[PDB]
Design a protein around this ligand. Structure first.
Ligand SMILES: *[C@@H]1O[C@H](CO)[C@@H](O[C@@H]2O[C@H](CO)[C@@H](O[C@@H]3O[C@H](CO[C@H]4O[C@H](CO[C@H]5O[C@H](CO)[C@@H](O)[C@H](O)[C@@H]5O[C@H]5O[C@H](CO)[C@@H](O)[C@H](O)[C@@H]5O)[C@@H](O)[C@H](O[C@H]5O[C@H](CO)[C@@H](O)[C@H](O)[C@@H]5O)[C@@H]4O)[C@@H](O)[C@H](O[C@H]4O[C@H](CO)[C@@H](O)[C@H](O)[C@@H]4O[C@H]4O[C@H](CO)[C@@H](O)[C@H](O)[C@@H]4O[C@H]4O[C@H](CO)[C@@H](O)[C@H](O)[C@@H]4O)[C@@H]3O)[C@H](O)[C@H]2NC(C)=O)[C@H](O)[C@H]1NC(C)=O
Ligand SMILES: *[C@@H]1O[C@H](CO)[C@@H](O[C@@H]2O[C@H](CO)[C@@H](O[C@@H]3O[C@H](CO[C@H]4O[C@H](CO)[C@@H](O)[C@H](O[C@H]5O[C@H](CO)[C@@H](O)[C@H](O)[C@@H]5O)[C@@H]4O)[C@@H](O)[C@H](O[C@H]4O[C@H](CO)[C@@H](O)[C@H](O)[C@@H]4O[C@H]4O[C@H](CO)[C@@H](O)[C@H](O)[C@@H]4O[C@H]4O[C@H](CO)[C@@H](O)[C@H](O)[C@@H]4O)[C@@H]3O)[C@H](O)[C@H]2NC(C)=O)[C@H](O)[C@H]1NC(C)=O
Ligand SMILES: *[C@@H]1O[C@H](CO)[C@@H](O[C@@H]2O[C@H](CO)[C@@H](O[C@@H]3O[C@H](CO)[C@@H](O)[C@H](O[C@H]4O[C@H](CO)[C@@H](O)[C@H](O)[C@@H]4O[C@H]4O[C@H](CO)[C@@H](O)[C@H](O)[C@@H]4O)[C@@H]3O)[C@H](O)[C@H]2NC(C)=O)[C@H](O)[C@H]1NC(C)=O
Ligand SMILES: *[C@@H]1O[C@H](CO)[C@@H](O[C@@H]2O[C@H](CO)[C@@H](O[C@@H]3O[C@H](CO)[C@@H](O)[C@H](O)[C@@H]3O)[C@H](O)[C@H]2NC(C)=O)[C@H](O)[C@H]1NC(C)=O
Ligand SMILES: *[C@@H]1O[C@H](CO)[C@@H](O[C@@H]2O[C@H](CO)[C@@H](O[C@@H]3O[C@H](CO)[C@@H](O)[C@H](O)[C@@H]3O)[C@H](O)[C@H]2NC(C)=O)[C@H](O)[C@H]1NC(C)=O
Ligand SMILES: *[C@@H]1O[C@H](CO)[C@@H](O[C@@H]2O[C@H](CO)[C@@H](O)[C@H](O)[C@H]2NC(C)=O)[C@H](O)[C@H]1NC(C)=O
Ligand SMILES: *[C@@H]1O[C@H](CO)[C@@H](O[C@@H]2O[C@H](CO)[C@@H](O)[C@H](O)[C@H]2NC(C)=O)[C@H](O)[C@H]1NC(C)=O
Ligand SMILES: *[C@@H]1O[C@H](CO)[C@@H](O)[C@H](O)[C@H]1NC(C)=O
Lengths: 48, 204, 230, 48
């Protein structure tokens, strides 16, 4: 995993947010409940 | 870790003491003056700490680690221990190397062996004492024998100490049963100094 | 930076040995070094005891290292606010008698991989001597040593089991100086002490003129004079 | 300064749990893409 403090999400220009440092080691446990998937356009549709 | 028992040199000469059993680079050497606390003279092999002269240098070749002291002086007389990290987090120390910068001259040891007394046997105890003195360097090994075969039991040997004449002296104490004392006629005491050995024998 | 050891200098056998180190000039909270102990038995080599550190990672609340042999009988503790180090030894024997030094461990402590790796002691303490005895105070057993070389022979007085030190042995109550010698004490497997003396005298003096050593022991209250004959 | 393990941020996923789900998910795609077909997975193509 890579860490980036300065971020522009949602394609925002003009405003960049700096994530402040955190004391100690950060640990988190979450549930993975779903995905965002895309299908390739190359076809060969009847193959794979 | 295996460290040589003794080491000697004249002022201005350079001494190199070794250590083996180090597969890692965590090797470090210490200096302990008699009646004082040990002080780290080197760490991480060659690297020196604060307030330590350049003449102290660590070195490690293969499985062998080495410390080098050039330009000897009075204050260099002490016991030198080596140590290094092993495995996961445990650390071990060597037997240590005793380096002496005492004054001249070299001399052969002197052994005087005393058999148990008549009053001592009455306590159902038998003890023989080898007195070794006037030797250089200050490290000597002592061995015991009965008639022929060596004696591996009851041996108590202590580190030698400098005398008023600057010559070192030591005493080894052998405690056994009166039964094995009267059975075995002669008891030999072997004292090994710089290769050459000096022997004494007593029989009742 | 100064390390000051404190605790009982005299402990009985099979009991619990407890020692506390007081640091000055540094914080035990510091993650740069480990804190522990190194004991040096009389006239012997340096042995590693153990070290710990509260500066932890995500899977632990700290780190604590014990020497495999001494692991069972020891307990290590660090007080961070009060800046103190603790050592507790359960079921102590006379074999555990040593000069205990307060030790600061340097190494890969401030930046490690996996577990922290302490390898060398950068800062030492003055240290104190702790003697473990199953007894109290005992008087030495005195036996004479009968001589037989080289025109002048040597004779002495034997000092057997005693505790604690010291013992003073003089020849004819300080009558002879030149050609007089005394050897250091020896620790027995039974936890006691022993030593001896030696004097060189001509063979012509052998006769009605005899030699008597004066033994003196303060703790056990022992003053014993013995004549030596071959 | 960083005091501790020298490491890069990392994300853990249990091999058994992800696989079990995958086996159940890959069968649902075959309710559309047909009873029998080859479904291969691959990481992101490229972009931001
Ligand atoms: C994502 O997934 C990742 C996995 O893919 C995951 O990584 C895993 O993380 C966890 C934690 O997050 C890891 O678990 C820890 O592992 C530590 C290290 O384990 C290694 O080392 C030990 C020790 O091995 C030495 O000692 C034994 C016994 O003497 C010997 O048999 C060994 O050969 C070796 O001996 C050498 O060193 C000695 C000491 O220097 C020398 O004396 C000796 O001569 C030798 O030179 C091994 O036992 C481990 O082996 C195990 O794992 C392998 C894996 O292949 C197995 O094959 C094997 O069978 C074993 O199962 C391994 O090699 C552990 O130390 C640690 O456990 C400690 O902490 C817990 C905390 O609750 C305690 O309960 C526990 O009792 C341990 O405490 C001791 O150790 C700590 C320091 O670690 C001390 O602070 C503590 O006081 C105590 O010390 C006492 O005991 C020591 C002996 O253990 C002694 O030396 C001390 O002096 C003192 O008396 C814990 O289990 C896990 O390994 C990772 N796995 C991988 C694959 O990376 C990752 O986290 C995940 N990510 C996230 C975000 O979750
Ligand atoms: C990451 O790196 C970090 C360093 O950068 C490191 O953080 C260090 O972690 C250790 C371990 O916790 C800390 O030591 C603690 O010190 C506590 C007192 O801290 C104050 O005083 C210090 C000295 O001046 C200050 O340095 C410290 O400042 C810190 O915190 C500030 C915010 O408060 C912060 O701004 C600073 O930057 C700095 O980070 C603070 O001012 C001390 O109380 C504590 O002892 C308890 O906790 C230990 C575990 O953390 C236990 O092992 C220990 O036994 C103590 O628990 C007992 O006592 C508590 C009350 O004192 C009770 O609540 C407990 O329940 C427990 O009591 C039970 O148990 C006892 C026996 O154990 C028993 O007797 C009781 O009766 C009862 O049964 C601890 O020693 C250190 O201060 C941290 N900081 C530094 C700079 O070192 C961190 O560990 C690393 N790892 C991770 C994952 O983050
Ligand atoms: C992401 O992180 C989470 C959290 O760390 C992970 O989920 C945890 O996974 C671990 C292991 O898979 C699991 O730990 C076990 O939990 C059991 C209870 O559910 C415990 O009983 C068990 O403890 C025993 O084993 C330890 C290690 O061997 C010992 O240290 C401990 O003392 C226990 O041993 C005892 O019990 C035996 C009998 O069984 C007895 O003989 C002994 O005397 C002693 O009493 C484990 O700790 C956690 O429960 C999980 N946590 C949660 C919330 O589910 C997850 O796996 C991580 N994911 C990835 C991908 O890495
Ligand atoms: C991927 O998913 C498969 C299931 O589709 C997992 O296979 C599982 O493998 C374990 C063995 O590692 C099976 O346990 C076995 O159980 C039988 C019956 O009790 C026993 O005889 C064996 O000794 C062993 O214990 C388990 O049953 C099996 N799953 C199923 C559904 O049968 C596989 O483990 C997954 N991937 C990984 C990471 O293993
Ligand atoms: C998703 O996984 C693929 C598969 O590993 C990653 O592709 C890899 O991309 C790197 C470039 O960053 C390739 O290195 C290149 O190697 C070729 C051949 O030696 C060389 O000509 C290039 O100059 C460069 O060094 C690497 O080969 C390539 N993997 C394979 C199997 O070809 C991809 O980076 C992954 N995507 C993400 C977002 O991580
Ligand atoms: C991830 O899923 C688990 C299981 O669905 C959640 O844990 C459950 O929390 C509810 C809260 O009411 C409990 O009733 C369940 O008993 C819990 N599960 C189990 C197996 O005990 C967990 O909360 C989910 N993750 C998050 C972030 O909420
Ligand atoms: C990052 O670089 C700075 C210097 O720009 C380091 O700070 C120096 O650290 C040394 C210790 O070796 C000190 O002697 C200097 O006085 C420090 N200088 C300043 C300006 O702070 C810093 O240590 C480096 N990163 C770290 C903390 O590892
Ligand atoms: C798909 O499977 C169903 C039964 O599972 C079957 O009726 C149908 O003919 C299959 N379609 C194919 C093989 O194209």
């Amino acid at each position: 995993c890579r860490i980036k403090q300065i971020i522009n999400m949602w394609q925002r220009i003009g405003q960049a947010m700096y994530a402040p440092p955190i004391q100690g080691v950060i640990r988190c446990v979450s549930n993975i409940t779903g995905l965002i998937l895309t299908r390739d356009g190359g076809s060969t549709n009847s193959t794979t | 870790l295996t460290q040589p028992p003794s080491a000697s040199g004249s002022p201005g000469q350079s001494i190199t003491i070794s250590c083996t059993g180090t597969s890692n680079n965590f090797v470090s050497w210490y200096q302990q003056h008699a009646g004082k606390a040990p002080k780290l003279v080197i760490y991480d092999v060659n690297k020196r700490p604060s307030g330590v002269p350049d003449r102290f240098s660590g070195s490690k070749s293969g499985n062998t680690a080495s410390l080098t002291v050039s330009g000897l002086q009075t204050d260099d007389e002490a016991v030198y221990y080596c140590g290094s990290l092993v495995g996961n987090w445990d650390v071990i120390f060597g037997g240590g190397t005793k380096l002496t910068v005492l004054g001249q001259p070299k001399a052969a040891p002197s052994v005087t062996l005393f058999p148990p007394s008549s009053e001592e046997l009455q306590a159902n105890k038998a003890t023989l004492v080898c007195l070794i003195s006037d030797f250089y360097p200050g490290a000597v090994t002592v061995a015991w024998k009965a008639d022929s075969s060596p004696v591996k039991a009851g041996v108590e040997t202590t580190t030698p100490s400098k005398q008023s004449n600057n010559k070192y002296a030591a005493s080894s104490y052998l405690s056994l049963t009166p039964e094995q004392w009267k059975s075995h006629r002669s008891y030999s005491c072997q004292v090994t100094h710089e290769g050459s050995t000096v022997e004494k024998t007593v029989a009742p | 930076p100064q390390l000051q050891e404190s605790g009982p200098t005299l402990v009985e056998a099979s009991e619990t040995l407890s020692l506390t180190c007081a640091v000055s000039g540094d914080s035990t909270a510091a993650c740069n070094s480990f804190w522990g102990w190194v004991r040096q038995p009389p006239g012997k080599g340096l042995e590693w005891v153990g070290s710990l550190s509260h500066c932890a990672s995500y899977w632990n609340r700290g780190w604590t290292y014990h020497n495999p042999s001494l692991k069972s009988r020891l307990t290590l503790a660090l007080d961070t606010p009060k800046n103190l180090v603790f050592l507790k030894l359960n079921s102590v024997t006379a074999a555990d008698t040593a000069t205990y030094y307060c030790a600061r461990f340097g190494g890969e402590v401030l930046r490690y991989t996996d577990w922290p790796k302490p390898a060398w002691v950068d800062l030492w303490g003055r240290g104190t001597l702790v003697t473990v005895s199953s007894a109290s105070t005992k008087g030495p057993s005195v036996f004479p040593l009968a001589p037989s070389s080289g025109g002048t022979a040597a004779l002495g007085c034997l000092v057997k089991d005693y505790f604690p030190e010291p013992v003073t042995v003089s020849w004819n109550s300080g009558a002879l100086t030149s050609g007089v010698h005394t050897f250091p004490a020896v620790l027995q497997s039974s936890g006691l002490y022993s030593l001896s003396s030696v004097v060189t005298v001509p063979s012509s003096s052998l006769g009605t003129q005899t030699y008597i050593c004066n033994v003196n022991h303060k703790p056990s209250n022992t003053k014993v004079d013995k004549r030596v004959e071959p | 300064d960083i005091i501790g393990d020298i490491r890069q941020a990392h994300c853990n996923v249990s091999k058994a749990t992800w696989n079990e789900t995958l086996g159940k998910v890959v069968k649902q795609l075959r309710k559309h893409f047909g009873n029998n077909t080859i479904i291969r997975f691959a990481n992101s193509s490229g972009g931001d």
